[PDB]
Amino acid sequence: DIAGLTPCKDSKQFAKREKQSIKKLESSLKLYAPDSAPALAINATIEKTKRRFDNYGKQGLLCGADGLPHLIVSGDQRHWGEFITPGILFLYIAGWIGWVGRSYLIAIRDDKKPTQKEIIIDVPLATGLVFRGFSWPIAAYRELLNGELVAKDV
Amino acid sequence: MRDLKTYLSVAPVASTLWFAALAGLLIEINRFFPDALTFPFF
Amino acid sequence: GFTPPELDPNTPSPIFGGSTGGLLRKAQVEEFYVITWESPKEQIFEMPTGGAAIMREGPNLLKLARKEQCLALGTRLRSKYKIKYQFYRVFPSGEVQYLHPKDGVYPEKVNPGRQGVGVNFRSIGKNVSPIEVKFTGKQPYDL
Amino acid sequence: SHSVKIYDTCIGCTQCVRACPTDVLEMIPWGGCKAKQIASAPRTEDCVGCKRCESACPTDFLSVRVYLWHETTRSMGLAY
Amino acid sequence: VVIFHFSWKMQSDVWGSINDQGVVTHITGGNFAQSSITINGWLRDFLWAQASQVIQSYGSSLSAYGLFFLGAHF
Amino acid sequence: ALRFPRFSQGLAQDPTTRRIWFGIATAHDFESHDDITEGRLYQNIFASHFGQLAIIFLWTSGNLFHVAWQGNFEAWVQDPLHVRPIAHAIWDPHFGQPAVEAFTRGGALGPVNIAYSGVYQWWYTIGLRTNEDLYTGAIFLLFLSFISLLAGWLHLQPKWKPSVSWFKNAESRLNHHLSGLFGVSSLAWAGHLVHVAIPGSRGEYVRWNNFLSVLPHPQGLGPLFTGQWNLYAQNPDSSNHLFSTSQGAGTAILTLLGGFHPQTQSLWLTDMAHHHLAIAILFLIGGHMYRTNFGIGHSIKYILEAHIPPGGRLGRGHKGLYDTINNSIHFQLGLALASLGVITSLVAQHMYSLPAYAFIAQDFTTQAALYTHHQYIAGFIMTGAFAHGAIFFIRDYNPEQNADNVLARMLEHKEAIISHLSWASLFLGFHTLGLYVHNDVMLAFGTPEKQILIEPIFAQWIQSAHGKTSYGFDVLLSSTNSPALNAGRSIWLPGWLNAINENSNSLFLTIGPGDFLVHHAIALGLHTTTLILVKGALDARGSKLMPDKKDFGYSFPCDGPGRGGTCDISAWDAFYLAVFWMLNTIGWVTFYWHWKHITLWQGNVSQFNESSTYLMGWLRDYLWLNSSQLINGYNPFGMNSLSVWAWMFLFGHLVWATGFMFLISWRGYWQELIETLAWAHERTPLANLIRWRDKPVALSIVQARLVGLVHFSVGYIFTYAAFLIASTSGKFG
Amino acid sequence: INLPSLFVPLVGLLFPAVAMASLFLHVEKRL
Amino acid sequence: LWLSGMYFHGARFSNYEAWLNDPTHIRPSAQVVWPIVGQEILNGDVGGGFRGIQITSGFFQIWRASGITSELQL
Ligand code: CLA
Ligand code: CLA
């Protein structure tokens, strides 16, 4: 496949690592009582590990000679779920945060003592402002086009 | 009450409450969908 | 134009028990400083080098190894005890040099008998760059 | 001996003179401000380079500038 | 330096396991007397030798100690 | 004057020990010396260059003499792969008997040192075979250094010293250096390779006494002037060819194969001679560009001033740059250091992947030592280039003569440059450290499969584009019908593809996620060091915190505690802080190289692949793991040949640590301590009869920073060199 | 006769001694 | 408040009684970690049918020397 890697579902070292992990987890389980709280916790962890490995095989991740999943970020459409749509999600959230904070700073910049509203957050105004980050992708775009995103005269 | 609200919104207190809420939210999201290495929905 | 007071030996020195912060060989071969004041009453003050000393009634004379020490002592005498002081620089040859207050009035108060030294008639931002004074003995600020 | 310069932006506030710990600066008559005063540096040979005078100057940029130069036993503040 | 001395001396000449015949096997086989007199011995027989426990802690219940080891270095 | 230093009258009057210190640390700063002029400065620089050439020749002559005298060359050439080359003998009266026993190696009669500079392989490849050749080379080089000193002295004397106008003749100097220093020199090297080295690698021993009686080619110079040059490549050396013997030898003197010599695992000598001949032709042609006394050619300043884009996006373009470069010597030094550092790093990168000396690829410790050597020197050269750029800004820059040209416009938007470079550094550091810590925590919890392993897919694609076929990308050279592949199938691609796809050499190593992460660490280091240096340079002339910085010189302690405090505000201090980052970045580079190569030499590349993704792997599987033999160099049960490194390893640990002293504790404490010490000495019997003559004083602030940095760097270098050499030589694999 | 035996002390003890003495005399006295 | 926290953790989230039955056998522990992000590996096998983080504060010895035998007293 890409970069000489093979799918984890049909890879062999991936399955070997899965088996070894479960064996290691089970080794501890046999020491305690069959149905004690530690035994239940260890069983839950084993089930979690099995579910994790099955999901990794299901999503179609690529596994190297090491038997571990590898992430392709070149832009291949078969792997957009590895970096590109999480990347878009991060960009949206981070722009939300930055736009909300900038809106707060611009809103409080007109008082005689703006610093007072900076060490003591004016929550009433902040609660109204935080929701602009839902549509910041549009507000920032029209802010740039309208030419007042960037401070002229500087 | 009014002064309690004022002090309760000061930088340190507000930041700690915000980060406690964020930590709880992220913890719950991880708990429901743990071991997530990719975005499979689309 | 303010004849500076002449240093008067025989004036008593403050009561002091001795210290390891006194004069050294520099006083012997280079220079040392002497400060004099009046102090209306006998009282205990903090020495600029060691512990505490007591000013005698009437004139007091103290010899220090640094001018900065003399100035610190004078500042304490002027602000804490409200005493007028003057100090000199003494060379191993036997010379004495009146130092402060140079013209009878302390340097803080403007006096009509002082000329300007090292005053530039321009803002600090109008100095030439080093390239213009390169390979000449002058510095850009000396101009 | 360090070089101390007084620039014409001086407002004659006198704060630098109060600060010098070796009596290097002075106040002299002048006519370009309200105080008719300006700082002078006639005894830079006793300057130790502490730059305590510059910390007291309220003008922006400074009106008194200390340029550290050749070192002497007086400028190095040595008692031995 | 004091705590390093205490730890190495205790491991070398005091702490250990007793056996049926009374033969004491010390955690470190009494190498302090002969190895602690050089800096190379302190670097090798103390730091290098005894860091194996912490660096290997990954994959076990002591993994937190290795994490804190690296974080403290940072 | 009237005492040391005589070049500084202000320092000679300092009554303290400072006069001595600053007397030594400003001897080569001619511009700040009393009664300095233009011609004086240039003549001093010229003579110092002659002195440097003499020193270099003397040093290489000493290497030759010692290898010829206590060396192993005659024995080494008999079996290059199974005998350790000897540098020089050891005569230390402090050695004990077991030390003498342990240090006698290489078949010597006493304790000796095993050379790791790689001179044996280099001298063997070029044609030197016996100790007599080494002796002749050493004598010739001693003569050469003597002649260099004679030239320097001659040009010092009046009536031979060039004028300033001569020094500033840039066009003629460029013409001669391109067509003469570079072109003719490479032409001569190609001549030597054709006449001596290539015959030497085929059995014949061509020397001064018979090189006129031997034809380098059976049809000498006939093909060359007739134009039928292919006759010089008609019979290459067979792939079953032992190096210094005629078994399987050819007659071609120039070729272009591209692979390696199968036995020596190094480049073909004929290919190298052809390379040097070609680039000699290129340099000779290109060195006729500028105008001199013959009325044809180019004037550099006109080319510069004519390169101004319409639309004024670059302002006045390069107008006025010729005069600011020709008159500013620090500009010239900065440009030279920049280019030199770039090509030194290039040498480091190319020497390990395309070895040119026979049997050096099999000498692993030599390869590692050379790579680390050249990388550290390149880092120092780059840091120096930036330092001298800042120095030029301070001293030789004229704002009015550079009005609105590229330099002024660089100065006037420095803040955007600095801020964006800061953003790049922040991004790289944040995400690289985040991924490393994530993987490390993941392995702490026993779940390696949950790591964020990103495949360096772009680099793998580039490798595939070169012809490698381990990633299955099927790109140029790795495809089958691509024009790029088809164009060179008959020249060099056979050998090149044979070498690149062969996976026992270092020609384009296979890469994975660990390589991705470490390369991004490298990028972080480069960007942060560039940030520090660029910020120090562009703000050298002054900033908002100190607008009149240009009048305070390149290096000064501070501006006092006023205005919030002005510690480390000079450009010298920016360079000072950048040296730490340079050391850190080159350390990461060499750690990566050495770990990858030590795991490849063991046939255990997997181990690196698994353990590189997380930092604990670096700490345990590399530093702790490869440091057992070194620390065991000597122990309570005796010592072996590695003890000398084990000692140095500790020595480098001490120096570095004492460096932390001058960097943390500052002047005032030490000054007061020295004052009380002076009192004590003056107050004691029998010793007050002895009197110091320079008043003791604590080290200056700038001097203390410099001394601390020097300790830091010396300890860094010594400890890493000890570790690298002991670990690679301990295994010899 | 062992050439190293003569020179190692010469360059490690005699040479530094004479050089340090001469340079101390040069640096440390009024001219 | 710190001491009260100590005693409460020893009372509820500890294997104090198991250690009391066999001191040399069980390794003292008075802290467990919730299973959230795979950190439950830190709940190591300390003996006495308990999984937690081993404590080196020496509280178990103090409680034994004081005469505390049950968790009601803690
Ligand atoms: C381990 C040692 C260390 C570390 C980690 C750093 C890290 C950094 N240095 Mg630095 N430096 C060091 C040693 C170090 N330096 C030394 C010894 C010197 C010689 C004096 C210098 C001199 C130096 C200079 C001159 C400069 C830097 C700069 C920087 C920053 C570059 C920007 C970057 O990479 O993004 C970030 C890199 C990171 C490693 C992120 C650190 C923060 C992480 C995410 C932790 C977050 C906190 C976390 C939530 C836990 C909080 C705990 C709670 C109790 C608060 C960076 C933060 C440059 C700079 O400032 O950038 C503009 C700069 O100019 N360094
Ligand atoms: C810079 C090159 C260089 C270097 C690094 C060394 C280094 C060394 N030499 Mg050596 N040497 C050299 C050149 C060099 N040599 C040359 C050109 C000759 C003449 C062919 C010799 C002849 C020589 C002999 C006979 C011996 C050594 C020996 C030694 C070793 C012990 C110290 C010693 O005896 O001092 C060096 C002794 C000398 C007599 C050197 C004189 C020759 C040069 C011209 C002196 C340079 C002085 C100059 C002012 C400074 C140079 C610039 C800079 C490096 C400071 C030591 C590792 C001894 C040894 O074998 O080790 C066990 C020994 O007995 N050398």
Ligand code: CLA
């Ligand atoms: C062709 C290369 C070259 C040249 C010609 C110059 C030339 C010059 N440099 Mg420069 N520089 C260079 C490269 C170069 N540099 C590089 C690569 C760097 C990066 C490190 C620097 C960084 C640098 C700085 C920061 C400064 C200069 C300065 C100067 C000027 C005065 C130097 C002087 O006299 O100080 C005297 C010489 C010394 C103090 C050197 C003695 C101390 C060294 C570092 C100790 C050596 C290490 C140690 C002994 C080895 C270990 C010992 C043992 C254990 C083995 C001068 C014109 C200074 C200047 O004033 O600019 C105008 C200045 O401040 N340079």
Ligand code: CLA
């Ligand atoms: C490895 C790092 C290192 C080292 C070696 C030292 C060493 C020293 N520190 Mg120190 N210190 C350090 C780090 C270090 N420090 C750091 C990082 C800080 C920052 C917090 C400090 C802050 C600090 C302070 C504030 C003070 C010291 C003081 C001292 C000195 C104490 C006097 C003494 O021990 O007598 C003897 C010296 C030693 C035992 C050191 C090694 C000497 C070797 C064994 C002798 C070798 C001689 C050899 C034959 C020489 C021949 C070589 C020839 C070629 C020249 C001593 C020299 C104190 C001091 O100055 O004393 C009054 C002091 O006040 N340090």
Ligand SMILES: CC1=C(/C=C/C(C)=C/C=CC(/C)=C/C=C/C=C(C)/C=C/C=C(C)/C=C/C2=C(C)CCCC2(C)C)C(C)(C)CCC1
């Ligand atoms: C500060 C300063 C200075 C300096 C600076 C510097 C030094 C910088 C730098 C820099 C650098 C050091 C850079 C580098 C670079 C490089 C580049 C930019 C490149 C490139 C590219 C290309 C062109 C490519 C091509 C190719 C080919 C050919 C083929 C194969 C592939 C490749 C891609 C490789 C001075 C003194 C002057 C002045 C003042 C200022």
Ligand SMILES: CC1=C(/C=C/C(C)=C/C=CC(/C)=C/C=C/C=C(C)\C=C\C=C(C)\C=C\C2=C(C)CCCC2(C)C)C(C)(C)CCC1
């Ligand atoms: C696709 C991709 C890629 C790449 C890419 C690239 C390379 C590009 C780019 C890019 C670029 C070139 C960018 C840029 C930019 C620029 C600028 C100039 C900007 C800006 C912005 C701003 C300024 C903003 C601001 C703000 C916001 C909006 C947010 C919040 C608020 C604030 C205000 C902060 C890769 C392959 C890797 C992978 C896959 C994906």
Ligand SMILES: CC1=C(C/C=C(\C)CCC[C@H](C)CCC[C@H](C)CCCC(C)C)C(=O)c2ccccc2C1=O
């Ligand atoms: C120790 C120390 C001192 C005191 C250092 C002194 C007094 C130096 C004393 C060293 C003596 C002279 C012996 C040094 C031996 C050297 C190896 C000799 C080098 C001389 C030539 C070979 C270059 C400072 O003055 C100081 C100032 C500012 C910041 C940090 C510090 C600081 O750390």
Ligand code: SF4
């Ligand atoms: S630097 Fe200090 S001593 Fe010198 S003039 Fe200023 S205040 Fe006075």
Ligand code: SF4
């Ligand atoms: S402090 Fe500045 S403004 Fe005030 S008198 Fe002195 S120089 Fe003038």
